[PDB]
Amino acid sequence: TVASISSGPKHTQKVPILTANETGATMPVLPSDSIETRTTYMHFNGSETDVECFLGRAACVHVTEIQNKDATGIDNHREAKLFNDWKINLSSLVQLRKKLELFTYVRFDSEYTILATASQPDSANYSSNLVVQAMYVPPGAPNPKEWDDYTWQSASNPSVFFKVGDTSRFSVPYVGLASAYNCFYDGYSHDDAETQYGITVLNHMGGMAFRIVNEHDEHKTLVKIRVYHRAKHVEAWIPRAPRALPYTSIGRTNYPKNTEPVIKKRKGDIKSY
Amino acid sequence: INYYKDAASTSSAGQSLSMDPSKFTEPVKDLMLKGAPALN
Amino acid sequence: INYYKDAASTSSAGQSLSMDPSKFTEPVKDLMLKGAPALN
Amino acid sequence: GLPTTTLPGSGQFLTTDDRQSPSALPNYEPTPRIHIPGKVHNLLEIIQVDTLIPMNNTHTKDEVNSYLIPLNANRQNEQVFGTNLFIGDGVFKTTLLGEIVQYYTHWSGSLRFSLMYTGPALSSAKLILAYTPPGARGPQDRREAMLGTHVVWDIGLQSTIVMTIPWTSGVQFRYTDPDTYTSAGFLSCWYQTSLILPPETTGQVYLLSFISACPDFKLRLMKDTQTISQTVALTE
Amino acid sequence: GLPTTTLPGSGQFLTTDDRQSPSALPNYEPTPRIHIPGKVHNLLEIIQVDTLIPMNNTHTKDEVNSYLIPLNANRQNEQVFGTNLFIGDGVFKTTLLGEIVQYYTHWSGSLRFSLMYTGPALSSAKLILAYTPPGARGPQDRREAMLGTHVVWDIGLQSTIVMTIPWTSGVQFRYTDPDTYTSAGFLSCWYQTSLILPPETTGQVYLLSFISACPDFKLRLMKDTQTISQTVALTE
Amino acid sequence: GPALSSAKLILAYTPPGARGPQDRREAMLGTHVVWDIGLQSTIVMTIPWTSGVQFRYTD
Amino acid sequence: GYSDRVQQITLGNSTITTQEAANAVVCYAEWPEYLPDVDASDVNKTSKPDTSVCRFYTLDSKTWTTGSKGWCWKLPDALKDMGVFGQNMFFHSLGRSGYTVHVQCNATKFHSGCLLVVVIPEHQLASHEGGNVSVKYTFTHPGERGIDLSSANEVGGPVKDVLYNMNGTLLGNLLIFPHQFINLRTNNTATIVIPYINSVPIDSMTRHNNVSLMVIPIAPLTVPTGATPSLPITVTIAPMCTEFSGIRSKSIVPQ
């Protein structure tokens, strides 16, 4: 492939460099339309800019935490972090979010990796070996109420059991209700006067509940869960302007008030170098 | 070799090697030729 | 590839792709045609 | 010795994975199969059999009576019953259809709603059933109702009427657990003319109503049902 | 049982590796794809669309005005604007090109810089745009500027002029984050003759300026952008 | 008008049955042409035959 | 003698002529078309009013003055009240449509000024409150009036800051969306053909707008000496290939 062809002096009536940008086109002008060039080859394919590659590496999408401790006398397991749920999202930690929102609709399978590490912040004789249970709870399933409910039987709901310190990995097909996930949605769920704007089920990817299977030892053990997400089989439509201001909320476009100028001011003139 | 039955379980896809910027760079209704005048 | 000798040890079965609700939805002795009167 | 590398996920137990295992009982011979009528292959086979809907839900303890929709002689213009179409909740929820839908997260497809009339043979009636697609309110009078999917039913020799709620939807799947964006409409029924009883006869007559899914139907993404739970393991 | 040996790296999780995994939802059927205009396959497809450069960066809070390069009637010989070419920083940094370049470590290729004139139709002007390849200082006067890559632009019916910064380089890749060894030059613009307004007209006229990449362009070695960060996880 | 002036007008035909339009919004919902005043000096609007009865009276 | 410059668009019973065009943009290089069966889901036969809905509606005019910040209309909202298009809209459960948008602004060879005319698929607005405040319905359904970016923040309304596109992105990059400029010195109209763009085959026309049309002054209007300091901008829009499905009772929407 040639990156530049050889081209010499020109004295024409045919001027490729004068255009009318009002038309909305970006005319494909090249170095050889306005200087004299020599042949050179590309030596490159643009492999690593493919959208499959761009969205295809694992990104941290969620960090939560649960603890193993005596539940005796706990009136609210959920509240003691005896167990914890997470409604899956890709817009809570901003790194991956800005990447996805370069597109309007996106379609892909997900590969999840879940790393779990334990901490024992206060005096323990040892490090126990805990098994985590991660249950995938689709909308309409009974939700766990205690850390050892009938729910955890999970007879119809996919669940994975792995050890703290290890990693669990499985992949979920594209679960969207429509043909693509909406990265944006300028609508409501119905014509209600007060219903929420922008947040939609069109994006919904399920939800996940974590708990330790082990009963309690004498000390307490903090287990912190990190969920990583990798898109595989990516398809993206309609590019948009990149995110400039900071994010404030999952699912709305809102930016913070009295934010700071995002364009760097010159130290000098327009004329400055 | 796929070891698994479902398609979601296969590895990453392989390069589009599609590439056609004209839907974005030249969505004009009447075709513009480089070198010919923009507005006639 | 089965690595094991016994049939119980193989993975899940593969979709019936059988599907015939008529034993449940139309177990009538004399055949009913949709569009013809139910009771003649 | 062949060199290997183990990946993330090694040693995990995923309740949904499907692999081979050693048999604990090597060489054992199972009992022969004999023929048994009734084999089921797909849950899609059974949700096409219709079952009764406790439409008359207004009681206070479960009773045979909540399966009976009453009809009054001589009323004109008025409304016989109304319900939204959240097949995973409300009237639908205990029906076989409702009961299976609840094992899945998403459904799509047409529903078949039929009414069988049980009044004396010498009576007569004309009813209108109306399906209102998502976007409008439950109709408030027949005029409103008759502008959407409807069937004038003429009560005759042929005892049942089968109304279909054709799949009307932007999004190709809806949630089985009730959700707004994903909502499916309303179903109402009104007197078209009115029920008329023969002489020597009196009182209320009832309609029985059934629900089953058309062959159209799709259910996907299995999950656990809110319809059953427990607090301690059972024993013998 | 086949004999194996595990190598260094077993059990590691590399966020960039690409392998198979069990599906948690065995046998699930995804929604059909429908057609949607606009599919993107390569980021290289989109960085060829031109976008506006806030060249007039001299303000103190972001304003529509930093997109406008002003022009003065009757000045001769003088300089319209100047900038270095660190596409990952400074004026370029918020443009789509700048914004994507920042996802990669290295770039190589030609850039297309165009200026669209917005002054009254009955005015006229001749400007010179000059590209100064690495190795010399930003030009200080047109004489200095005109000895490097330049285009005399004659403002006419055809409203825009497209200047190309041809890839001039020893090393075949440059860093997107500004680096010296790897630096690309300067871009300046001066009056060639001068802007002239028609009668009954007055004040400043402005040029809009765009940047996009030639088909020449290469970007490689993906990394994280300095353009976005956060202090606590967001919630709904 | 002078050659260096410019204008955009809308001409609207309202078929029988409605009143003479009272504002452009009303007018623009019937047969209309946006005319852009340019080099080409005249605009030709056609009142297409809109009618139940195939002849009308001249009086 | 054909120029890129003169054009005629006839759609239904209405025609537009421009003698000073700058080509026309067809979003993503695709022209509006009806919904194919292979892509269909709802089993209902659809209604295609054709020429009674696919004609040109001219919205009320705006006034560009030196202080203008820009205006924003949403589709199909802007047309919610135009003739039979609008009726069909409130009466069917689902509908689908593409459009031809023609923005008009003429001046003289002594004026200067340049507007950006852009179509943004799925333009989800931001609340000026920050945090996770929502933007109420009424605020994103201005109707033919559209939203005036130089109007004041209101409560439950969107933010109207132009350098941020009403969503946290920079004005400068709007050029990645199908768009066309109106530069008084060149141009006097902008025309964009919009194909139907959604993640579902057909949708509700009232709970979801699928494009915002935005007209933004970028190079300020500058009139000749002692000229009146303003110009009107007019927007005319025509639904094209419209289809409605799931007819019934007639939606009632807030406010």
Side-chain angles (χ1 to χ4, degrees), chain D residues 132 161 213:
Chain D
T132 296
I161 194 149

Side-chain angles (χ1 to χ4, degrees), chain E residues 13-43:
Chain E
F13 160 39
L14 165 65
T15 73
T16 237
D17 196 355
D18 180 18
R19 338 297 301 160
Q20 302 179 55
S21 293
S23 171
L25 321 190
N27 270 101
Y28 169 88
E29 270 167 295
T31 310
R33 328 176 127 70
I34 64 198
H35 167 74
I36 296 173
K39 180 131 134 178
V40 173
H41 309 92
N42 213 278
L43 303 178

Side-chain angles (χ1 to χ4, degrees), chain A residues 49-81:
Chain A
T49 37
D50 196 281
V51 311
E52 175 97 9
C53 184
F54 184 67
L55 300 179
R57 32 190 63 189
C60 183
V61 295
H62 185 61
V63 180
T64 196
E65 124 185 78
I66 60 181
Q67 35 207 279
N68 183 25
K69 55 200 178 134
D70 180 354
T72 279
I74 315 348
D75 276 24
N76 174 18
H77 292 196
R78 162 64 166 298
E79 244 189 47
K81 335 286 215 133

Side-chain angles (χ1 to χ4, degrees), chain B residues 20 22-32 37-40, chain G residues 2-5 7 21-26 28-29 31 176 186:
Chain B
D20 174 50
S22 9
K23 8 151 139 83
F24 313 117
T25 71
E26 267 155 278
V28 299
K29 168 158 164 315
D30 321 291
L31 167 103
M32 273 179 2
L39 316 139
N40 29 11
Chain G
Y2 299 16
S3 167
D4 251 8
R5 291 271 214 33
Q7 299 219 115
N23 207 316
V25 155
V26 176
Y28 302 115
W31 199 285
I176 186 71
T186 296

Side-chain angles (χ1 to χ4, degrees), chain G residues 60-191:
Chain G
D60 211 45
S61 268
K62 272 45 258 268
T63 294
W64 178 18
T65 89
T66 211
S68 287
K69 302 271 110 227
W71 311 255
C72 167
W73 295 263
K74 252 105 176 61
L75 289 177
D77 190 47
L79 304 181
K80 90 316 226 312
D81 263 291
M82 305 283 188
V84 179
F85 172 88
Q87 286 306 298
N88 271 297
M89 189 172 141
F90 282 98
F91 274 107
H92 300 73
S93 202
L94 292 164
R96 146 201 230 278
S97 184
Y99 304 98
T100 283
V101 167
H102 182 60
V103 179
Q104 312 140 247
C105 177
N106 58 282
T108 82
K109 328 185 109 54
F110 304 78
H111 291 70
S112 355
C114 173
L115 300 173
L116 165 75
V117 171
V118 55
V119 164
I120 308 172
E122 300 287 347
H123 201 206
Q124 193 193 321
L125 292 189
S127 187
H128 59 313
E129 223 129 303
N132 64 322
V133 180
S134 125
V135 173
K136 340 261 275 212
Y137 194 97
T138 351
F139 297 107
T140 66
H141 300 76
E144 141 199 358
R145 234 196 82 120
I147 302 179
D148 175 340
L149 245 60
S150 72
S151 86
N153 278 346
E154 32 193 331
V155 167
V159 42
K160 303 145 124 121
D161 227 322
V162 218
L163 248 269
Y164 304 136
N165 305 322
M166 305 180 82
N167 61 196
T169 64
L170 271 181
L171 167 73
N173 292 340
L174 229 44
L175 266 51
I176 186 71
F177 297 106
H179 68 275
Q180 142 141 150
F181 284 95
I182 295 189
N183 181 17
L184 301 182
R185 57 141 30 235
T186 296
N187 228 2
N188 97 20
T189 55
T191 300

Side-chain angles (χ1 to χ4, degrees), chain B residues 29, chain E residues 35 37, chain G residues 11 25-27 29-36 54 96-101 192-197 238-243:
Chain B
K29 168 158 164 315
Chain E
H35 167 74
Chain G
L11 200 45
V25 155
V26 176
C27 297
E30 277 193 40
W31 199 285
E33 80 191 1
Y34 298 79
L35 167 58
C54 293
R96 146 201 230 278
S97 184
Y99 304 98
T100 283
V101 167
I192 301 179
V193 184
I194 310 164
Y196 176 68
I197 301 161
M240 93 200 234
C241 290
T242 311
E243 254 156 313

